[PDB]
Structures are given as C-alpha cells and as structure tokens.
Amino acid sequence: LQQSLELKRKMLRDKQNKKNSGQHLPIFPAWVYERPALIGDFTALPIGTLPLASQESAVVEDLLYVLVGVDGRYVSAQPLAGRQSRTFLVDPNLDLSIRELVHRILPVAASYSAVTRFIEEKSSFEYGQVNHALAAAMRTLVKEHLILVSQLEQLHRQGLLSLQKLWFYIQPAMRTMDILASLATSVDKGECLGGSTLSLLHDRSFSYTGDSQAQELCLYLTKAASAPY
Amino acid sequence: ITEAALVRDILYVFQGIDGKNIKMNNTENCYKVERSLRDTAVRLSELGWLHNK
Amino acid sequence: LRRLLVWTYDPKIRLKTLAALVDHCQGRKGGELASAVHAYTKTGDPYMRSLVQHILSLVSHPVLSFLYRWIYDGELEDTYHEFFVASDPTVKTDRLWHDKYTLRKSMIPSFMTMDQSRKVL
C-alpha cells in the first residue's frame, strides 16, 4: 500500500510514452486503497479460563473472521495493510487439544490478506491490461472463499460445526489460497506486469497435473487473464 | 441485554439511521459498538459505513 | 443468520463498488465523469462490469443527446462544461468555417478516441 504509490506513477509514465493516442485515461484515487472498508481486508478476555466445550465454539467463530483478515475477539489481526506479509496474534493460552488444530488452520488467513492487497493494487491502470483482468479474476477466487466463510459462520451459529468440520471444509480452499498467494508475492517481487504475468500463469498450470484441484484453478486464471490479450 | 435489541439496531444501520448499542463515533471509519454477539459487527458495521458513504 | 450477514452479503459487494464509485467520480462533470464510470468497466470481473455498465448506460444519455444535435443540426448544447467542442460565441460572416469550432479537450471521454471527436467537430 505505502510502497505502491511510487510504482504506479513510474509504470504509468513508461506506457504513456509508448502510446500515441492514450487520451483521458483515468486513475483511481488513493483513498479507495487506504480505507479498510473499501477493500476486503482489515470485550477481549483471556480464553484459557473458560470450559472446554465453550473454548471450541469461541476459537472457531473467531478464526472464521480471522480468515478474511479481521479480528474475531480473541485472535487479533495485526494492523499493517502493507506488504505481501501479514501476521496474527493468537492468545498465549488455549486448551492444547483445540490449540494444535487451530495453529494448523491459521496459515490461510495470512494467505488471504496478501492475496487481497495484490487484488486491490493491480486492478488499476498502471500495470497493463492483462494484469488488471488477472487481479479482477483473482477477485472471483477470493469471492468464493468469502462465500465458503459465510456458509461456515451460518452453520456454526446453529450448532452444526466444530474445528474438525471446519478443518475438513477449508482444505481445498487452503490450496487455492496458497497458489494465489505465492503468485501474488512472485509478481510483486520481480516487479512483473503485462505479459510477464501471463507466462508465470502458464508455467504454474503445467506444474500441477497430479492434483486436478489446483490444475483447474490455473487453467481458469490463464483463460480469464488472456481475454484482453 | 438480550440479542434482539442488537438485531433491531443492526437492521437500522443499513438504513443509515444510527442504533443504540451500535453508534458512529468516527466518520472516517465504520460504526463502533458501544460473546458471539459482538463478533458479527466487525463484518456488518462496514456495510453501514458504505451505505452512508 | 449471524445477524442477517448472509442476506446482506450479496448487497455487500454491491455496496463496495458504488462506495468506491462516489470517490472516483469526485469533483467531475461531463465527459470526465463518464470516463470515471467507464473505468470500472475496463475491469475483467463480470459482476463489477455488469453492475457498472447499467449506470454507464444512464450517465452518457445527456452527452449523446448533445452528440446527436451536433451531427444532425450543427449547434451543440450544454449548460455546464459537458461537451467535447468549445464553440466560439463570437459572430462570423462567411469566414464562419475557419474559426467557429475548436476542440474542447476535457470532455472527450475514454469510450471515444480522439480521432472520433476531431471528425465529429
């Protein structure tokens, strides 16, 4: 977020000199990115002292909000809204049997915040026509993750969900978030834009052919990003 | 306080008319609430901010 | 249902895009505002594009009404700065052709190329 404001103007000036009729091409203002409600990515008591069968409902409901980048009540989303890395602070006490499985579910939250910030910054007009459609089509894969999360919260309110069921439900979505997060970090890191982020999507699709859970993702991402090309 | 009051308040911050147990104290960011009860608001109050925007 | 969260989720994204749209159209008028609406249909999301293109269909209706009174009759209309030609209000006689019409370069939109606006002038 903070670092991107430089990158935008430099990459705009290159492609503005290249074209001979690019006229009245607008840019999105910065406070669309700054505020944590125009983007998809954002009392509290020590959870250890409660009974066993209440801490479960507690940390599951809190974790379901943590997946999309915001505090539940007892596990907090640390405020950065900057780079391709985000950290979360779980409370230093919990029942061990719940606590190990919570730690195993926790990477998909850091593998959502980094995806969503890349989706915010590179749907603009300074990273090339294919990268805009790419971030706009990774936005759809984040929309399905959000739909999953809404259904899980609904079932958890009516007493039909636990951390074992939550762990079983999020595994394909954990794979989808891992692939998109690695891709977002890689495209940001090498300052890739345009067609160099239409080649990486081709390589990743060839890599996975032993799963068919990630292969279909990569095929769909390549199909959607090459529609302006 | 019971849950039904919170239901009635959240149903008004979608209209842009402030509640009682949930109020807008800052206008730059979303509504702030004045245990499962509290956790819904961290997603729901943003929608009141955007509707007012 | 987590206090009507599931019901509000389908309008939730529909609130995000419009609340961003009030800030991208900030302080604009005429063709520049039409560009600020056309910006959100340069995107490759189907839902965002289908949401915005309806607003775009409404927003360029006065602009194109001014456009069809300028190709068919020859005298434009606006009430504020809304039109891609900035006409000379001073009278000319038979030397009308050379000086009367010059290109305004703030109200050419992004769904019209500069070639089009020059030719329509």
> Which among C56, C104, C115, C113 is positioned nearest to C81, based on CA atoms?
C104
Token pair belonging to A48: 């250890």
Cα–Cα–Cα angle for A125, A129, A133, rounded to 5 degrees:
100
A72/B42 Cβ within 8 A:
yes
A132/C114 Cβ within 8 A:
no
User: Judging by DSSP bridges, how do beta strands A88-90 and A75-77 pair with one another?
Assistant: antiparallel
Alpha helix positions (H), C4-113: 5-24, 31-38, 46-59, 61-67, 96-99
Question: Within an 8 Å CB–CB cutoff, is residue A164 touching chain C?
Answer: no
Q: How many CA atoms lie within 13 A of C4 on its CB side?
A: 18
Q: How many CA atoms lie within 13 A of C71 on its CB side?
A: 12
Spatial separation of the C-alpha atoms in residues A163 and C116, rounded to whole Å? 61
Q: How many CB atoms lie within 10 A of CB A19?
A: 9
User: Judging by DSSP bridges, how do beta strands B22-23 and A88-90 pair with one another?
Assistant: unpaired
Residues 6+ apart with CB under 8 A from B46: A37, B30
For C54-92, b/e burial (b = at least 16 CB within 10 A) is ebbeebbebbeebbeebeeeeebebeeebbbbbeeeeee
For chain C, the chains sharing at least 3 beta-carbon pairs closer than 8 angstroms are A, B
DSSP A31: H
User: Judging by DSSP bridges, how do beta strands C85-87 and A75-77 pair with one another?
Assistant: unpaired
Token pair belonging to A37: 């409600």
Chain C positions in Cβ-Cβ contact with residue A32 (cut-off 8 Å): 20, 23-24
* Way it was determined: cryo-EM
Residue indicated by tokens 């529909």: C14
Token pair belonging to A45: 């008591």
Spatial separation of the C-alpha atoms in residues B35 and A122, rounded to whole Å? 38
Spatial separation of the C-alpha atoms in residues C85 and C107, rounded to whole Å? 8
Rg (CA), chain A: 20
Of C20, C43, C44, the CB nearest to A38: C20
Angle between helices A96-105 and A52-66 (to 10 degrees): 10
Testing the interface with C: which of A20, A24, A125, A147 to mutate, by most C Cβ within 10 A? A24
After which residues does chain A show a gap where C to N exceeds 2.5 Å?
42
Token pair belonging to C98: 């050379």
Secondary structure (3-state) at A90 = strand
Chain C positions in Cβ-Cβ contact with residue B7 (cut-off 8 Å): 3-4
Rg (CA), chain B: 10
Identify the closest residue of chain A to B46 by CA–CA distance: A37
Residues 6+ apart with CB under 8 A from C65: none
DSSP A49: G
